[PDB]
Amino acid sequence: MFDAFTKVVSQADTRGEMLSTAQIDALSQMVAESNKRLDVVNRITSNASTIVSNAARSLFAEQPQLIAPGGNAYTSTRMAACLRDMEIILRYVTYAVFAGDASVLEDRCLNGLRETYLALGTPGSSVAVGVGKMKEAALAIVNDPAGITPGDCSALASEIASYFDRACAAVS
Amino acid sequence: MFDAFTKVVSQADTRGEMLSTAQIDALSQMVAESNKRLDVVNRITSNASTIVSNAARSLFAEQPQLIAPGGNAYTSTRMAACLRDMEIILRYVTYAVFAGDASVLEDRCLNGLRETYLALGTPGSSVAVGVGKMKEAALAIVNDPAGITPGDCSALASEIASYFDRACAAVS
Amino acid sequence: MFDAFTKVVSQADTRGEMLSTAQIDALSQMVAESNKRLDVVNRITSNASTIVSNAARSLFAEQPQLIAPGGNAYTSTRMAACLRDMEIILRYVTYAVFAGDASVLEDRCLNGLRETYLALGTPGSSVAVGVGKMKEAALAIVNDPAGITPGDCSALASEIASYFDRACAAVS
Amino acid sequence: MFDAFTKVVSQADTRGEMLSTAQIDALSQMVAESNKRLDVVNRITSNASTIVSNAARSLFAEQPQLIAPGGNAYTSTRMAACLRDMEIILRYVTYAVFAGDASVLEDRCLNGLRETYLALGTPGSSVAVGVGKMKEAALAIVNDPAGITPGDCSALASEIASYFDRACAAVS
Amino acid sequence: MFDAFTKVVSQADTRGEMLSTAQIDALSQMVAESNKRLDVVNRITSNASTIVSNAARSLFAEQPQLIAPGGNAYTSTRMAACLRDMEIILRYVTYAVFAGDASVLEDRCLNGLRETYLALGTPGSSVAVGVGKMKEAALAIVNDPAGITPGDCSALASEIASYFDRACAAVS
Amino acid sequence: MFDAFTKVVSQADTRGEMLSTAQIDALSQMVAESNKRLDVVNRITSNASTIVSNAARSLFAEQPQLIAPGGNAYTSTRMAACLRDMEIILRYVTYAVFAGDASVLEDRCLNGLRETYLALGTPGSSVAVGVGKMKEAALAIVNDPAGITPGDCSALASEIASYFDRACAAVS
Amino acid sequence: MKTPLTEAVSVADSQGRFLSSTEIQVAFGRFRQAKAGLEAAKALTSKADSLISGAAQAVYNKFPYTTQMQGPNYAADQRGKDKCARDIGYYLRMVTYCLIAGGTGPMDEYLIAGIDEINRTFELSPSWYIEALKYIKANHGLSGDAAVEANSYLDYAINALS
Amino acid sequence: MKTPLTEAVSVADSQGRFLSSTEIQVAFGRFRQAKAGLEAAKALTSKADSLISGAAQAVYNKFPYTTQMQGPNYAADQRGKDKCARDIGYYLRMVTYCLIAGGTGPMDEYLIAGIDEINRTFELSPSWYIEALKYIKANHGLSGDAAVEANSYLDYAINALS
Amino acid sequence: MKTPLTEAVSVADSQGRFLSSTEIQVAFGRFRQAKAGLEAAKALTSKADSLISGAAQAVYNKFPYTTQMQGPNYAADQRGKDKCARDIGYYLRMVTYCLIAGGTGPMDEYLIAGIDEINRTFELSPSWYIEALKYIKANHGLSGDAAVEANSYLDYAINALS
Amino acid sequence: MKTPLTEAVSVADSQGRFLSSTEIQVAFGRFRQAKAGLEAAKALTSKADSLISGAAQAVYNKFPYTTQMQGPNYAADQRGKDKCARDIGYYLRMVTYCLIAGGTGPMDEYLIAGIDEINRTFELSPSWYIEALKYIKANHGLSGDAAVEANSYLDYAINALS
Amino acid sequence: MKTPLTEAVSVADSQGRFLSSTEIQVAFGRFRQAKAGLEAAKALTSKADSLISGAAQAVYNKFPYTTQMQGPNYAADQRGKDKCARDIGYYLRMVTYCLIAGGTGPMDEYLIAGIDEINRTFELSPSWYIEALKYIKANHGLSGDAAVEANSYLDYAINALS
Amino acid sequence: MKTPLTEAVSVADSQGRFLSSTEIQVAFGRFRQAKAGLEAAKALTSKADSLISGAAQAVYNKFPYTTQMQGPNYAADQRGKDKCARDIGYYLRMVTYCLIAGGTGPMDEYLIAGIDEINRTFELSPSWYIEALKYIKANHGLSGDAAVEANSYLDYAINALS
Ligand SMILES: C=CC1=C(C)/C(=C/c2[nH]c(/C=C3N=C(/C=C4\NC(=O)C(C)=C4C=C)C(C)=C\3CCC(=O)O)c(CCC(=O)O)c2C)NC1=O
């Protein structure tokens, strides 16, 4: 995986060049905002359970065929794996938000997943909906103005949504 | 894997339904005739080596190209493997007869066996003939009015023939 | 794997025949010139490092893009892998010279290598160049009339070139 | 391993002798009472969690040093392990009751358990008390004239107590 | 393993007590001088190879029988092992300096080492002597007032000597 | 393991010396009479089954308590283990004869065997008897002057007797 | 799927062995037991609705707070009451399946595997279902080997929950 | 355990490596977070009894049946009330420990590992402890990184239960 | 030792599971079968000498060369005839043991394991023993499940030899 | 396949090593031996018919019943005698292959692998083939390292049957 | 790749864990360090030519033979003098990369992995690069935590060569 | 160790096989080789002192700086020259051992294992030793198969150094 730094480093390395002052300044700007970047990891992490369970509960409400007998999320063995997948996606998203790069989310979680759900008989299009709900909840939990210094996080909150959107696009 | 009971159970679970009284009565009728089933398991099993070796000798008698130098059954290693393939197929067939369902034979034996034989250069057709001879021998042994309480076991014999036919079909 | 002996044996066996006297004659003929074969084994082996390093340097000098940043041989970890691939191929070729049969080079080395380099995004034909460069070096090393009983080693050199060609053709 | 049958068989084989009629009659007498045996297997098994947890709570009630901070059963990991040790011992005891021989409990559970507890710092004596409580509870459950065909099962109860005593003895 | 914090935490946990305010002030005291700690970690780490090789070279000069033919450091394999041992011991000390606790050093590196040297017949006595020189050189390196903000680092040095001494004592 | 050469090499290496001409001369003596050495390996090897089975059969005839029911050689599994052990001992003996050094016979075979036979309850002093017969048969086979260029092999016979006696002593 | 026949086969297969008198004996035991088991499953199936409603009510009795508290994990609204009846229905149906199969297999595969995860995640108390099961056990009206076998599975479910 | 220093060491150890600038940076973060965390644990230790008491009472308030139901797993008698108080005390203590260590390690080792087995074996509902943790979170009167970190641990424990 | 009970236990143990109705069913089958099995073993035990001598004679009839040829592997002297009667006795005794156990376990452990090695090494023809067994099978006089079970083991020994 | 060269290469390969003086010495040994070996293999090929017929006859002489007993495993008819002649032919040919390969490789790959299973399956006595091998060994009329190396393989085959 | 963030994630991931305060502390450390590190790499980037030329010259000074020996491993002609400067350039570039990553990761992946292999294969003396690194360390004119960190990568590279 | 005999035994032992004509051929090769090898080892021994000195002077000639540069890794003084001649002596003695053993085994176990680590650690340049060996090839004066085998080890040592 890469992070915000090593990504640029590798990009520069395969050109055999040092980082320009512009790239460094960019990374510095990124550094100057990194408190808010860990507040979000903290906040999303601290609500992982309810995020997953609320998103899942809503998903099943809107799509009762998933939990109906014969449904892919019926039986407590598959429901657990379903909640598990949700939690995993969320986790890797938080990894992406933490690292400041999507590589960890792509390399490990998302790549090959559409095909996996295809093989299993899992509706990825439902997973994506789950991910969407998780996203909406996560961003709101993130944007909470209580118990934190006020400021702008419009940039970070867009990146996070970028990651969630990547996750969603990967299984649709 | 599936037996006569769990197959119906699995069919029922996917519909979110309990076994109908008819479905149960059928299984009861199967249970009523189970002694015969185990008698044939015993009879085929007890004759295993004889069934295999007789079928093999027959097969090589009608198909001498198999044991001629350059034949796929020539050399003792390939002859051994050949005999064992026969033995295995018979074994999984007895498993099918015992279980009351073809699932074991399907999943643990026949699945991917043709491609195997193709890759090896083994003529699956000959295998099938072998299985045919084994079917004949076994079924003749299952009937044998000697040393047993007399009764009708036609359906069971049919079922057995079914499993053998499955094998013979799968390999070619 | 086969050598010069078991290759003929394994050919005769499939026909159920003993070796013709002409085959035994050819083999005795090979035996008559075995000292030369082991001389080339010893000679190529003895210069294993230089044969590889010279070819590598010569390859990089002619194809500077391979070691330039972004090149597949750039960084030490990949350069190591490259040198190692060269060494490996040379080794298996010497195994082929020693055995007097190419099967060890076929099955253990060259089998699947193309697709491997393909997956890696490695230029197999550059490998083929390297091998092409190691071949000539080897033959030059083998044809040295210094410190050895003078004699003719043409067929042998031909056989060596055959194996190297085998290697080159399998990656290209 | 040994059951009530194979133990005698093994004893007989070493003497190169067939089972005497008395040895057989004994086993027949054991067979005559086998329904009770399985009834207790069922009864202890069905009450597993209750037996274990009740015994544990009792044990911790009389021996609060175990659950005090610094006690060997303090922290949930050690409490879990503790509970499971109880469960395991009970399980292998039920195996002994089922098998009609103590060999399973001996060989697969108790053997080398004291040294284990010693190395760990776990007080085997406390384990033994736990097993004692489990013995009491289980035996009370086995008796229970409710919901069963009445009869005498004193010998069986004794045997069970025997197995429990074995465990309690082995651990301390 | 334990660091300076979890050590106190665990010692407190076994009593079932919260940290006393004094115990916490004690830790804040350590926090207040952590820059120096990491300075020495960096400093010793930065001269690992010279610290090892100097000590070793000097060790061999004072005890030439170690490298004499038949000696325990004769041959390049045993010499490599020897240097490796020096480096290992040095490493696990820096671990202790970094962690602020000797638990990792004793647990992972030292405990069971004299027995190893026993079974190997290795002269632990000389090893300790090696550790002594490494200690001296490292402490010299740490106390260098060049290229660093000046202040008192005597407590830290005193702590380091303790680790080196535990290492030296463990194998003596 | 060592052979006749590397054994002398190791001794010379421990002192940091080159083989004195005397040692080399001795080795040259060993070289000179190595056709005999391999002749016995070939002869003994070519009669393995018969040596073992003869010794075993007569052994069971001298000491019938072994094969009597309850005896250590009773049952086919232990009879097979027994014949196997005899065969292993013979095999490693031939390895020693071939290698010109007993190290392989000592380390990989006879080491700890005395204790094993004790733990198992096998009478080692019968294994020794078993070996003492294989020896007698073996040198009888080796000393056979038919179908061989006549010469003296007293030294070698002595050496072989050495190894058989070695095996015999190592199990009692 | 843990059943006598499948288990017998699988043990025979894991040893690369033809079935012997051992597995035959297993089968005999199975088929002997099935005579009562199938009948039992039939009875329960016929008593399904009654047993479910009864068990649900018993749970509501034992834990009245489950009918008052707000939250998606409670039965204070019709939705939760439906979820409840559904779950208890699942349990009962699993018991019948177990009677049909002659083992805990169906319940294991369809229910037990992951039950902890589900109960923990959705905040459902295992004791509720224990209470439902204890009641079903009391009211199923079965007798003989039928009742014994059924109660084995009931108590198994209970053990899986504690 | 899971702490910056010990993890930093364990990683490097698993790689057979000397500590680099990375581990030094981990340490640098730790020692600066320590300034707040160490004092946080202090403030929490000072308010221990009050927080535990209030939390227990909060549990009893939200789940009244715990003070009324007979059973070894309830605080309907003195024994159970002391059990409850003890457990809540353990939780709070673990939180302080996590603040001391700068990581969840202590809680993981002493509490989280096997909590599911315990809660399930002794029929203890996670919601109770979730409620206690909620109450403690809402009453510790901390602020700044102290509050954030402590609350991260509280939410972690809450997460381990849900 | 392959027996129904031991197998049941071991499968239960390999899964870290308490015994369930499955193993109970195995046991029921076993104990039902034992009623005939033990009796059978008794009968054979009482018919031992006769059956042994008979089988030996049958082998001598089928293969007369075994009573003429010199060599330690033949029965042309009294020694070999004793070895023969002994071996056949072993086989019969194993069959009885199998009847007692309810499985091939005893025969497997005491006889089958290494039978090829022994026959090959000592140059004993498997067909001799097959002939002995075929005869024992004909002359044992058993009937019902007893005979069926016994013949299962006989044919098993026969299969082990071919 | 077990030959000197192939084993040398296998050794070298399993160590990621280039061939050194060791493998070279192995090869030198092989090629020195092959001078007699190939000659031997050539010689035995010319004696095939007579050696096989004589061997078969030797077997028939030692074991007359094989020419008298009915059954597919015996040689009382032409069908049976041809199989025997063929088999002995296979053995002899394998010996030649071994002489050519300089090892037991060919015979191991083509004959020894599965010999027990085949002989055990079709009720073929190893003693017959041992007798045949003894005859061939006694009647081949080779000399020098030829006869020795050939006899090593003959005796090897003999041991493979004992 | 050794860097604070990627590591922290990779640590948490192999444990199947969400990021806790530990990794956040690692991050705080990294970001606090980055403010100096980025400035450091930025500075070094501007001094590349000077430091590289100076280093190469220092090497040629320390080891004059490199400028007056025949062979492709030496810098007695133009190609070699360019190869050397290239290599030193690579080293410096890797240092700047390491300063930006906050760890030795880039230098590990791009340079150290396989350094011994290269140096041994192409006859490049480590001492040549130790001198080049020693020069750079004593001429980069950095100050503060920039120097301390940047010099931790130079000494790390030195250790990798010793 | 890598020698014909021990490896012949090793492969046979890993197969669990009695030796055959293969290992015998290996042995024959080894013994045929030893006749020249031992002689070579002798000749080299009686010329040791000369070869080492000449080799040392050759190294000094090719790399003059090794006799001018201070530091313990160089031979600018007495001790260093002693170390050098010692090392060269060791290298030669390994060659002798290899001739004695019939393989690179001794040199492998006593010298090759860790040579990279030592050379890197003690700043010893392989080029020096390669030169020293190159001289020895030229000056050893051996002839015949004795010379070819000796050179194979020298070139093996060189390869290990490059
Ligand atoms: C280990 C746990 C931990 C974390 C994670 C943490 C984060 C953190 N957030 C901070 C401020 C801050 N946090 C935010 C974030 C927000 N402002 C908003 O209105 C919103 C919605 C957001 C959410 C993204 C902002 C804007 C600042 C002020 C500017 C800044 O420091 O970046 C600060 C610096 C100020 C301070 O000392 O509190 C830190 C250290 N502190 C800790 O102890």
- The 3 state secondary structure assigned to chain B is CCCHHHHHHHHHHCCCCCCCHHHHHHHHHHHHCHHHHHHHHHHHHHCHHHHHHHHHHHHHHHCCCCCCCCCCCCCHHHHHHHHHHHHHHHHHHHHHHHHCCCHHHHHHHHCCHHHHHHHHCCCHHHHHHHHHHHHHHHHHHHHCCCCCCCCCCHHHHHHHHHHHHHHHHHHC
Closest CA in chain D for residue G162: D49
Determine the residue of A30, A36, A46, A97 to mutate for testing ligand 1's pocket, defined as the one with the most ligand atoms within 8 A of the Cβ atom. A36
Residues with Cβ within 8 Å of G22's Cβ and at least 6 positions away in sequence, in order, are G8, I2, I3, I4, I7, I102, I103, I104
Q: What is the domain extent for residue H77?
A: 1-162
When scoring H112, H152, H155 by the number of chain A Cβ atoms within 10 A, the one with the most, hence best to mutate, is: H155
Q: Report the 10 Å Cβ neighbour count for C112.
A: 12
Closest CA in chain H for residue A39: H148
Q: What is the residue with the minimal CA distance to atom 27 of ligand 1? A: A149
Which chain L residues touch C42 with a CB distance below 8 Å? 148, 152
Rounded distance from Cα A150 to ligand 1 centre (Å): 9
Judge: E74–F16 Cβ closer than 8 Å, yes or no: yes
On whether the CB atoms of residues E48 and K159 are closer than 8 A, the answer is: yes
Cross-chain CB nearest to E48 (options K147, K148, K159): K159
Instruction: At B15, list the tokens.
Output: 């519909």
> How far apart, in whole angstroms, are the C-alpha atoms of residue I140 and residue I127?
20
Q: Does J95 touch chain L (CB under 8 A)?
A: no
Which burial class, exposed, middle or buried, applies to K68 when counting CB atoms under 10 A from its CB (0-12, 13-18, 19+)? exposed
Backbone angles phi, psi at L17, to 5 degrees: -115, 145
When scoring I11, I21, I31, I33 by the number of chain D Cβ atoms within 10 A, the one with the most, hence best to mutate, is: I31
When scoring F45, F49, F86 by the number of chain J Cβ atoms within 10 A, the one with the most, hence best to mutate, is: F49
B/F Cβ contact: 3+ pairs below 8 Å: no
On whether the CB atoms of residues D162 and D102 are closer than 8 A, the answer is: yes
Residues with Cβ within 8 Å of B76's Cβ and at least 6 positions away in sequence, in order, are J110, J111, J112, J113, J114, J115, J117, J118
Integer angstrom CA distances of residue C75 from B57, C70, H2, I144, K123: 64, 9, 35, 81, 17
> How far apart, in whole angstroms, are the C-alpha atoms of residue B160 and residue B138?
9
**B82: distance to nearest CA of chain G, Å?**
16
Integer angstrom CA distances of residue K46 from A19, K97, K140: 11, 14, 10
Residues 58-87 of B with CB under 8 A from C: 68-70, 74-75
Judge: L113–E80 Cβ closer than 8 Å, yes or no: yes
On whether the CB atoms of residues I106 and I98 are closer than 8 A, the answer is: yes
Which chain B residues touch G21 with a CB distance below 8 Å? 42
On whether the CB atoms of residues G44 and G147 are closer than 8 A, the answer is: no
Residues with Cβ within 8 Å of A74's Cβ and at least 6 positions away in sequence, in order, are A66, A67, A68
**K6: distance to nearest CA of chain E, Å?**
21
On whether the CB atoms of residues I113 and F76 are closer than 8 A, the answer is: yes
Judge: H19–E95 Cβ closer than 8 Å, yes or no: yes
Residues with Cβ within 8 Å of E18's Cβ and at least 6 positions away in sequence, in order, are E12, H41, H45, H48, H93, H96
> How far apart, in whole angstroms, are the C-alpha atoms of residue I13 and residue F133?
47
CA-closest candidate to residue B116, choices B56, B164, B72, B79 = B72
Closest CA in chain F for residue J156: F46
Q: What is the residue with the minimal CA distance to atom 42 of ligand 1? A: H145
- Per the structure, the count of domains in chain C is 1
Interchain CB contacts (distance < 8 Å): C and L: 16
Q: Which residues line ligand 1 (CB under 6 A)?
A: A 33, 35-36, 38-40, 42, 142-143, 145, 148-151, 153; H 144-145, 148-149, 152; K 21, 24
Instruction: At J27, list the tokens.
Output: 């090869």
Which contiguous run of DSSP H or E holds residue F7? helix F4-14
Rounded distance from Cα A35 to ligand 1 centre (Å): 5
Integer angstrom CA distances of residue B85 from B48, B108, D19: 13, 13, 40
Rounded distance from Cα A30 to ligand 1 centre (Å): 14
> How far apart, in whole angstroms, are the C-alpha atoms of residue G87 and residue G133?
11
Closest CA in chain A for residue K86: A16
Judge: D57–H118 Cβ closer than 8 Å, yes or no: no
**Which ligand 1 atom is at minimum distance from the Cα of A32?**
32
> How far apart, in whole angstroms, are the C-alpha atoms of residue A86 and residue A168?
11
Dihedral, CA of residue I90, residue I95, residue I96 and residue I101, to nearest 10: 120
Rounded distance from Cα C105 to ligand 1 centre (Å): 62
Backbone angles phi, psi at A144, to 5 degrees: -55, 120
- Per the structure, the count of domains in chain G is 1
Query: HSE (CB half, 13 Å, CA atoms) of G19?
Result: 31
Judge: J113–B80 Cβ closer than 8 Å, yes or no: yes
Instruction: At D169, list the tokens.
Output: 């003895």
CATH code, domain with C110: 1.10.490.20
Residue C13, helix vs strand vs coil:
helix
Judge: B70–C17 Cβ closer than 8 Å, yes or no: no
Cross-chain CB nearest to G116 (options H63, H64, H116): H116
> How far apart, in whole angstroms, are the C-alpha atoms of residue L133 and residue L104?
15
D/C Cβ contact: 3+ pairs below 8 Å: no
Judge: G4–I22 Cβ closer than 8 Å, yes or no: yes
> How far apart, in whole angstroms, are the C-alpha atoms of residue I84 and residue I77?
11
CATH code, domain with L38: 1.10.490.20
Please count the residues of chain E. 172
On whether the CB atoms of residues K26 and K5 are closer than 8 A, the answer is: yes
Instruction: At J30, list the tokens.
Output: 């092989």
- Distance in angstroms between the alpha carbons of the first and the last residue of chain D: 25
Instruction: Kindly give the residue spans of alpha helices, DSSP state H, lying in chain D.
Output: 4-13, 21-32, 34-46, 48-62, 76-99, 103-105, 113-120, 124-143, 154-171
Q: What is the residue with the minimal CA distance to atom 5 of ligand 1? A: A39
Under an 8 Å CB criterion, which residues of L touch E?
72, 109-115, 117-118, 121-122
Rounded distance from Cα E99 to ligand 1 centre (Å): 28
Integer angstrom CA distances of residue H152 from B137, H96, H159, K15: 73, 12, 10, 19
> How far apart, in whole angstroms, are the C-alpha atoms of residue H112 and residue B140?
65
When scoring A29, A30, A92, A95 by the number of chain K Cβ atoms within 10 A, the one with the most, hence best to mutate, is: A95
Resolution in A: 2.6
Most distant pair of Cα atoms in chain B: their distance? 60
For residue G96, the Cα-to-chain-centroid distance in whole angstroms is 7
Query: HSE (CB half, 13 Å, CA atoms) of L111?
Result: 25
Residues with Cβ within 8 Å of A105's Cβ and at least 6 positions away in sequence, in order, are A92, A93, A95, A96, A163, A166, A167
> How far apart, in whole angstroms, are the C-alpha atoms of residue E67 and residue E63?
8
Instruction: At K10, list the tokens.
Output: 């990779």
Closest CA in chain I for residue F81: I114
Which chain E residues touch F15 with a CB distance below 8 Å? 69-70
When scoring E1, E2, E5 by the number of chain H Cβ atoms within 10 A, the one with the most, hence best to mutate, is: E5
Judge: J106–C42 Cβ closer than 8 Å, yes or no: no
I/D Cβ contact: 3+ pairs below 8 Å: yes
**F15: distance to nearest CA of chain E, Å?**
5
Chains that touch L (3 or more CB pairs under 8 A): C, E, F, J, K
Backbone angles phi, psi at H93, to 5 degrees: -60, -45
Which chain I residues touch D16 with a CB distance below 8 Å? 93
Chains that touch D (3 or more CB pairs under 8 A): E, F, G, H, I
I/H Cβ contact: 3+ pairs below 8 Å: no
Judge: F42–J152 Cβ closer than 8 Å, yes or no: yes
**I154: distance to nearest CA of chain G, Å?**
12
